[PDB]
Amino acid sequence: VSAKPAKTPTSAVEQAVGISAIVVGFMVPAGWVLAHLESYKKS
Amino acid sequence: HYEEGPGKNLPFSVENKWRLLAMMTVYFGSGFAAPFFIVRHQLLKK
Amino acid sequence: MFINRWLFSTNHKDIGTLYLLFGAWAGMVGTALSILIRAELGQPGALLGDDQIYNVIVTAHAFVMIFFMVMPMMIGGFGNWLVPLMIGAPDMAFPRMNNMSFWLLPPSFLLLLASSMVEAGAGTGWTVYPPLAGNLAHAGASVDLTIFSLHLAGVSSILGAINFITTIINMKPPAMTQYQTPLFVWSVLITAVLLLLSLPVLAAGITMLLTDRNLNTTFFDPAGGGDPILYQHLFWFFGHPEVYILILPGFGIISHVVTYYSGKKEPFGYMGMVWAMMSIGFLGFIVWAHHMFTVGLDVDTRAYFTSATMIIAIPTGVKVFSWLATLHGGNIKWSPAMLWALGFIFLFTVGGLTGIVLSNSSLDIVLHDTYYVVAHFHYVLSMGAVFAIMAGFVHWFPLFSGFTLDDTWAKAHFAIMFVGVNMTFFPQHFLGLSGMPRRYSDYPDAYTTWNTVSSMGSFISLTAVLIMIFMIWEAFASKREVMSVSYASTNLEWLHGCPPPYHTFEEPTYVKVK
Amino acid sequence: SVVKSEDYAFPTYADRRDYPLPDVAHVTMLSASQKALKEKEKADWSSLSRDEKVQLYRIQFNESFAEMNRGTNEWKTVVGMAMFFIGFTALVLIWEKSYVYGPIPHTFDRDWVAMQTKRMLDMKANPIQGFSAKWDYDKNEWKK
Amino acid sequence: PSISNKRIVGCICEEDNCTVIWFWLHKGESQRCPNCGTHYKLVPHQM
Amino acid sequence: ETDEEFDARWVTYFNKPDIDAWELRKGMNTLVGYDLVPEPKIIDAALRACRRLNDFASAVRILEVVKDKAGPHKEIYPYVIQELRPTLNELGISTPEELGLDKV
Amino acid sequence: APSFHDKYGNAILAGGAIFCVSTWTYTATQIGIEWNMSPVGRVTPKEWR
Amino acid sequence: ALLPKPQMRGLLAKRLRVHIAGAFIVALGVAAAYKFGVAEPRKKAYAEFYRNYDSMKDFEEMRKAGIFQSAK
Amino acid sequence: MAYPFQLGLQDATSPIMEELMNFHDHTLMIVFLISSLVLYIISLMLTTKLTHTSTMDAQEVETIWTILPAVILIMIALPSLRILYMMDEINNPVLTVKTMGHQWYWSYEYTDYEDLCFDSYMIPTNDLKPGELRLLEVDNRVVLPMELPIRMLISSEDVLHSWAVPSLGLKTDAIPGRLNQATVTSNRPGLFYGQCSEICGSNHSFMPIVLEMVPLKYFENWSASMI
């Protein structure tokens, strides 16, 4: 499948911000609820 | 008539990269965070 | 404007798009559940405490990954997008029933989530065997909400199956036969046939389970006259057709991808593919009691059933060897979907061979409900069905969206996905052989080390799907278009451009016999 | 420039070794010197020098077969990103071992596993090949 | 026949052949099948 | 069928007096997909057919696909060129290694 | 023309290999994961009562 | 001198036949390697264990350390 | 019972698990063979520069293509059916023991003569004696004579359990209102460790089975002592 040159091409820094955004937005809630299970067990 | 073309056959606008990145991460993060909060709920029950 | 386009939609492409979105969300829900399971099994001890919440997570992982990730995406999404495009139809035959099937799906998901939220919890496994699923061990509303989730998903998929069979059989051009259609069309025809032939059996089974729970019947109560072996018979009479449903459109997708990216004009032995798919479909209906080799059946009955597993092993062997045979002398283009298809071939071969090891009832005495079974069904489901979903997604993301993915990120995603799943599910063979049973929240110390290794592999797969999301965003962060597609003459869905318009085939195809 | 919406109907210059003679010329519109080359083309090829040959072959086609089969080096950066992301996975697991996971059960320290191993060898647990068959029951040591 | 400027044409140009091959056919002269060369011509005037 | 009627049918098909571009391209595109390095009389007929309808660069990719359809072993292409040299210097067609199209 | 992969690919290969091996030997050796190794030839048996 | 005529027609088929011969030999080699490494040593280990086995002495060695709940 | 870094099965004590282990080695050698075929072919035939992308004879190899997996499946299935019929002989047992799987514990009835019955619960982790096993030690071990045919009738009071001992090659469903049969023999004395294999609630991981197999005279002394 042939591909056109990008209409709005991204650079390396914006892709780094994107991968960091996915990592932080996926690891804050699950990591927060996994960071203290014994608090939910009435510590 | 409805829009025809690339990026317009989708139920969400793709004309900006950053608001769509925020949209994807909140949608798929709500998906990833639902069962964790469920498990928090049955731990908080008893 | 939005409501009439999406909530009131009556064409197949929009419903396939909504399938892709909903199944991506539900798949990531299931991935979170799988990470939770492997987090309990990582180190010895109880991170969550009791086994009840762990069984709730296990059952939720099974239902969410079966009926809400592979099922809607694979069958509904790829069939609705491609089947009227492959056969040259303007739309489905009954588009309102297709829209109703989609909109019944998130009610079923909400009922499943509410089943998990109610304090009893549906911690029974995805087998909903009584008297564990009765009103004594699980006196509450979790099992009932689970039963109605299965009812809604079943009605959704019967409606979709009816719509698919009538739009394949009838909406062809009047010159083409059924043996001139593409292979994915054949796979979804046979899939829809077994769907409507198998789903009412579990519908009746869980209806009788519901009446046993709340209407004081004794269908499966041993103190009243019934027995749970009847429930096991009906459940697995649906259940092995269900996993053949889970694997057959994957066969169509990998056949299409291997045919395309090798440069071939057609798969080798099209009649062999068609015959083997109808043989697998006809022969998956009489193999169900290989799931009950330890219930105490007759020895002659299990002899018949293991012979039935051998004769169902032969035609998929014909399919995988012909998949090998259509790689002969082809211009092998090293696309990412090619890597997904070759990983499909190898890992699905390994999973099927472990299933053949399990198929002997003599060794199924030893290996029943151990982790050897878990390795078998994950090497078929979580590798074959997932790799076929990814192969179809990578191959048809130019068609669905209009933009092309970054192939370098796609090859990296395949690499870490392959490493993660192979490190997750290879020590489970050793844990099953050593003798750790299924559904265990804590194990003895001798099962520790492989469990530790297995837990690490799950996180790698998390990284895989994490960067997968970035891949999708990168396409919409690039907006690189498609001038052209190679081999557009053989494949009909690529002939209207990327993406195709709302109204296609108003002027239909011109094909003649005489 | 931007071409109209019939980019799918008309055939395109497809560049692969499976299709050696494409149906579309790569350079559609031609300059005046290229029309002079095409006018000269009707005569014999003996009066054609090197530069006219290579420029008309570049007019009709994009790449030779040596250019399209070249070994570029993307597999190294694909597996390099792979080992990046597996390393980030490993540091995520360092965090999860540090904070999420609690203490190990008490049956894993050295005295308990020593008495455990003595009970393994004492009860002769699986002594044909696996564990108690790797121990000397006369010298009271492991098998060498 | 057609009502537009082009139509998708599917050729089964030998019998007992599985894969139909599809090609766009426009106005003007007779285009050919892209493997067999049977001539197809478009006359767009029907209703 | 066997060798000689294959060779005779292809050399008569490429020596069509009213040859045009579409069917020469279709003959080459069907010939390349065969499990067969083409016999040098067929390639001779194809080169003269390219000369008949006044096309140069198609003949250069004809020579290129004879070069790279042989595959790994390299005893085919110098043999085909060493048999086709009277054709190669009777039409003015230039060989791909001398045109600089094999230096990547 | 020098493409992206030509020297950056060697750089990413070297960096990925060294980063992965360093972080995995840290997470397998240093963070106190009890691997539950095979006790053959390694433990001495202690007399339980 | 000049070059002879090599095989022009179909080396894919002859490559397939020589490598399908190699495929059968190497696959039988893998199967025989696993068998002669694992399966037959296991069978002869079982034969060596059970051919000269006394169980009264084995039970006496187990019961001399106080493991059974029935023999004190 | 299991040891760390174990790859294969637990080794055999009953004759049945010796034949099961030999058949497992046979079928895993077959799986290794055909996986070597698939892997070597897929590694071979993507690694060439020769091409053949034209019409090919669709049906000229299917007879061998169909009879080789059929004959290998027959070669698998014949010893499978042999050992499948090797578990349903005339038993003529010596002892009959009845197990009932109560709600997360086991109960044992030796009631051929002088009716004896007891309960098996796990010794908790905090109350383990030194040297014992976590999650695998019971209050009352289940004492049987060795190298004898012993009938073992398995059921449960309320829900589905699975009475399983892997090293003796036994795994039988404990179904309420239904009495399944197994036979158990041995060749060595000692302690054999199994646990439940069917989902049975919130302590499903927490019911083990300990089979202590002793000589006949010590089994008689134990039976006289426990009553």
Ligand code: HEA
């Ligand atoms: C993708 C879904 C899928 C597919 C295709 C299969 C395919 C098969 N499955 Fe499985 N199975 C499941 C999903 C699937 N299964 C699930 C989800 C369960 C769990 C249910 C539960 O909870 O209990 C399960 C459980 C399950 C069990 C239960 C084990 C137990 O309860 O103890 C058994 C028993 O043997 C079994 C057998 C088989 C067999 C024999 C095949 C065959 O169809 C495989 C054949 C496929 C091949 C790829 C082999 C062909 C390849 C060749 C190269 C030819 C081989 C030729 C020779 C060896 C001569 N399956």
Ligand code: HEA
């Ligand atoms: C579709 C079926 C499916 C899939 C994919 C998986 C995937 C996984 N499963 Fe699952 N599993 C089951 C079906 C599945 N499983 C079933 C049916 C059971 C039996 C339950 C029971 O005991 O009753 C089970 C049981 C089961 C257990 C048993 C727990 C126990 O009994 O103690 C465990 C733990 O190791 C486990 C782990 C995993 C892991 C680590 C993955 C990983 O592979 C997770 C990674 C998967 C993905 C990341 C999905 C891929 C999706 C995408 C890449 C996104 C797609 C989106 C787009 C393309 C837009 N599974």
Ligand code: CUA
């Ligand atoms: Cu009883 Cu699990």
Ligand SMILES: [Cu+2]
């Ligand atoms: Cu099954």
Ligand SMILES: [Mg+2]
């Ligand atoms: Mg069971």
Ligand code: NA
């Ligand atoms: Na745990």
Ligand SMILES: [Zn+2]
């Ligand atoms: Zn034709």
